[PDB]
Amino acid sequence: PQITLWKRPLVTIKIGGQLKEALLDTGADDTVIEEMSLPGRWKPKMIGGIGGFIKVRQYDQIIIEIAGHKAIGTVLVGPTPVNIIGRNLLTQIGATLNF
Amino acid sequence: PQITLWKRPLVTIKIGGQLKEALLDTGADDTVIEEMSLPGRWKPKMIGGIGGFIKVRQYDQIIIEIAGHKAIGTVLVGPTPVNIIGRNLLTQIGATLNF
Ligand SMILES: CC(C)CN(C[C@@H](O)[C@H](Cc1ccccc1)NC(=O)O[C@H]1CCOC1)S(=O)(=O)c1ccc(N)cc1
Ligand SMILES: [Cl-]
């Protein structure tokens, strides 16, 4: 699908059995999802941006269905205002920025 | 061009006669650049990032060249980790997300 940017590029995703809305973000290195429970071991990490840093839990090898496309990779779970799909998963679904 | 996301989508921008590096950021509503001197009066603006809200200076009708493409629009100046080209200017250069 070809997504224009007149508005936030939001899509529906499936993770850990729940349905959520997330932003397709080329500016985000890794994917970050709001507080939720995920299975497995995790390790703490700090990610920073506009406003500073937040502490997140790094879960590896998580499966996510992005707009009907399955993908595997690291997911950061923490107090983010919005669910963000980063480059680590955008690449897996073959997303590109065109102009 | 067609930009894959295996690495940060960085591009050269030309603003105020200077060459700078900037990130094509679909998850950013506005364009935010590091401290520098811009012409005209500014208005105050509050923007929200991953770590909270910050105060920036808004300059309108600034001429900016993004990867060789000329745009003219709003540019915010403040304490940002990297120069960010947000949706306000991406729409001007006709950028889309495809997959
Ligand atoms: C600042 C860039 C370099 C990185 N951020 C991505 C950006 O797309 C970020 C996404 C976002 C949108 C709305 C609320 C909160 C975050 N937009 C952003 O700050 O929008 C501001 C600037 C203009 O409009 C509002 S990040 O969230 O800090 C980040 C850092 C590390 C990881 N692993 C993932 C995400
Ligand atoms: Cl590829």
Swiss-Prot record, chains A, B:
Segments for region (Dimerization of protease): 1-5, 49-55, 88-99
Recorded superkingdom: Viruses
Location of the active site: 25 (for protease activity)
Signal peptide: none
Domain Peptidase A2: 20-89
Subunit structure: Homodimer, whose active site consists of two apposed aspartic acid residues.
Protein name: Protease
Organism, as annotated: Human immunodeficiency virus type 1 group M subtype B (isolate BRU/LAI) (HIV-1)
